[PDB]
């Protein structure tokens with residue numbers, strides 16, 4: 535599948551992201567073996583995005599939509615739902631499944 539969502543800690547079970555809302559998260563991105571390539575936690579600066587604008591990889595678009603506020607989850611994202619056969623220069627190999635540890639902090 536494009537994205538698999540595995541819950542580390544549950545959310546509120548009620549408030550799921552909608553278009554027009556700003557999602558505020560912490561994340562760590564890694565390959566399937568846990569090798570880290572990026573993190574907002576390390577910047578002590580949360581990351582913000584919105585649905586419906588093609589502004590995040592599709593695995594986030596579909597994965598974070600399945601999370602409720604407060605949830606921490608592992609999103610396992612297939613290459614086609616991430617950087618595909620290309621990868622990301624300097625960072626992500628071709629054909630890489632990505633794992634993001636995401637905490638959905640709030641909706642703004």
Ligand SMILES: CC[C@@H]1/C=C(\C)C[C@H](C)C[C@H](O)[C@H]2O[C@@](O)(C(=O)C(=O)N3CCCC[C@H]3C(=O)O[C@H](/C(C)=C/[C@@H]3CC[C@@H](O)[C@H](OC)C3)[C@H](C)[C@@H](O)CC1=O)[C@H](C)C[C@@H]2OC
Nearest residue numbers: 561563571572573581588589590591594616617622625626
């Ligand atoms: C203009 C520079 C502008 C950069 C900004 C705002 C700095 C960010 C804080 C960090 C960078 O985005 C950094 O994050 C990563 O380390 C990372 O962990 C990651 O994969 N993401 C970050 C968290 C959310 C999921 C995912 C994502 O979707 O990021 C978006 C991304 C790169 C979407 C593309 C858009 C084109 C489209 O063709 C492509 O489809 C395949 C998807 C990003 C927030 C953009 O919306 C904004 C930017 O690129 C990748 C490995 C390398 C990245 O550097 C470039």
Ligand SMILES: [Cl-]
Nearest residue numbers: 556582583584
């Ligand atoms: Cl935003």
Ligand SMILES: [Cl-]
Nearest residue numbers: 583584587589
């Ligand atoms: Cl925006």
Ligand code: NA
Nearest residue numbers: 587588589590
């Ligand atoms: Na943008």
